[PDB]
Amino acid sequence: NHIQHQMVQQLSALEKSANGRLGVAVIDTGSGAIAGWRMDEPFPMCSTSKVMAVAALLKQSEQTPELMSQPQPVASGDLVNYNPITERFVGKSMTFDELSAATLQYSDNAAMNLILAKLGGPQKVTAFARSIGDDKFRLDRNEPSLNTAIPGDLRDTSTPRAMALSLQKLALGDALGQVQREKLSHWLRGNTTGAASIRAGLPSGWSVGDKTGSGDYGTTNDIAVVWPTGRPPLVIVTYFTQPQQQAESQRPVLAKAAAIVASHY
């Protein structure tokens, strides 16, 4: 942990003002420095777990490049709680490229389940996380139950530190092949659900890729790769969860956390 005293004070005050539990990690990839707040506690990942799932599928495509263009039938039975793209393909097919874009950029939960099926389930996403040196990530359930976000429950959690290091290896480093890393980074940059989260706290000119998540207990999450103008990229994880199951989401908390980390860099 390389966090400055001032940044700790600011993140602590933000957490208290928001009445929740905040977890933040920032990696400066130029120096390798890592900093943050509660960055080793488990937090429910919710939809941010989808990055690891798509990455696992992209790793498999390295040995079968046509895998991503293979049509996959979509059925009404695949639909769950939130299916913004897949609901339009019932009775038709989507490729794994389309399914990956849908789950990353629109957070389509049926698409996530179709990807989990191809990989062999949540347990195989966890095995892929281990294969990139992430010993904290655990995916236990599929959609939509992986979003229950119960305090004290270890299912479907990771830590801000582990998720930041994994997102660095996947989107910037060498955990994936070049074609696959660039596809993942492009999909993250094209996310449509992140305007009010990390992106809102960063300079408007910077290029950003991110994946949000939400769940019960007011869980409000975002993980980002940031390409600041003129200087090496940053990786930012902001996880936030609240005391009561019915709590409302607090996206401005993530924006402010991002602004706090962005200033100190």
Ligand SMILES: *C(=O)N1C[C@H](NOS(=O)(=O)O)CC[C@H]1C(N)=O
């Ligand atoms: C992911 O956390 N989920 C799927 C979808 N995500 O959209 S979000 O990232 O903009 O929050 C809706 C919320 C959540 C879920 N409960 O399924």
